[PDB]
Amino acid sequence: SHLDKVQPVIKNSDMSVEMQKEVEEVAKKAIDYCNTDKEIATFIKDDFRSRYHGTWHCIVGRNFGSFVTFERSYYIYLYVGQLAILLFKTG
Amino acid sequence: EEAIKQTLRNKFNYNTRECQTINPSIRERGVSTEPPPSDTICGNITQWEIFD
Secondary structure, eight states: OHHHHHOOEEEEEESOHHHHHHHHHHHHHHHHHOSSHHHHHHHHHHHHHHHSOSEEEEEOOSSOOOOOOOOTTOEEEEEETTEEEEEEEEO | OHHHHHHHSOSSSSOOOOOOOOOOOOOOOOOOOOOOOOOOOOOOOOHHHHHO
16 A cells, blocks of 8 residues: 555656656655665666666755756656655766 | 871971879778767765765
8 A cells, every 4th residue: 555655746747648657656666676765766777778778867865956958858857755756868 | 188287297396295183092991989988876965974
């Protein structure tokens, strides 16, 4: 029932609704698999890099802020509990 | 009349110069440009590690 409790929320999602839905599952799967925050960042990047190729940069934490240059239609910013999974691909 | 024509074309009434232009020799070369290697870095920052 923990997957129903976390209920991951997506403030800013400059991405297609299909690719967004995939991130929610990976985001939930990442946290319940991982023992620390450093491991969460590593699992997300590696999983997306395999699915969609290129140069991802993943950041997650309690309190931060983020001005970045990204491949247009490859940027999502979702917060779950107190963890903001921020992933973005660059050229 | 044929000989007279050949007799009309002289050495001092029809000089015969040679002229060419200086042409550089063609040459086929390869150049592969590969950008700097890009290394993954993983850093975590907590309030204590900053203060420490």
